[PDB]
């Protein structure tokens, strides 16, 4: 839920092999992690209903919030000028306005309705200045090593 998959797997390695394939309490996090890697977010969004013990319900909510955030990040880094059949549909928001607060929280321009440009250009860095002092220093170092008595 906190999105520490590295620590998740580091800890999953400690436990025996049979318990990670038998115990119903250890098999829920593993299944959720596997689905998250696969990208099948719908599977987890429907599998929230099944819980080995009511204690897991608290953390399922934070996992869902984090998965929404990860979907938003994937959409931002990928894609170009929104769509994905409207952001709400893929973000799994029941009400149309429920995504507005999170859109405001993130730096999204809020263009036409359900149309937020992600500016994937990243400024498209094209300016080049021929770094000259550093190259001169490098060649002078080459000359110094060639000439100096080792």
């Amino acid at each position: 839920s906190q999105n520490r998959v590295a620590e998740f797997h580091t800890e999953l390695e400690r436990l025996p092999a049979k318990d990670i394939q038998t115990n119903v309490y250890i098999k829920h996090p593993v299944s959720l992690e596997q689905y998250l890697m696969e990208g099948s977010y719908n599977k987890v969004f429907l599998a929230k209903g099944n819980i080995p013990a009511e204690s897991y319900t608290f953390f399922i909510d934070i996992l869902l919030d984090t998965i929404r955030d990860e979907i938003a990040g994937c959409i931002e880094k990928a894609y170009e000028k929104i769509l994905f059949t409207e952001a709400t549909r893929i973000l799994f928001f029941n009400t149309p306005k429920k995504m507005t607060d999170y859109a405001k929280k993130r730096g999204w321009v809020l263009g036409p309705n359900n149309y937020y440009s992600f500016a994937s250009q990243q400024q498209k860095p094209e300016d080049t200045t021929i770094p000259s002092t550093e190259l001169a220093k490098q060649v002078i170092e080459y000359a110094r090593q060639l000439e100096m008595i080792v």
């Binding site: 099948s40 994937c74 959409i75 894609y79």
Partner: peptide
Amino acid sequence: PEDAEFIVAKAIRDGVIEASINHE
């Protein structure tokens, strides 16, 4: 194709593929 779109977006964010999606 929704699952395929999600998988492709995940790959693009992960950097496995240098591609951009366009659902319009």
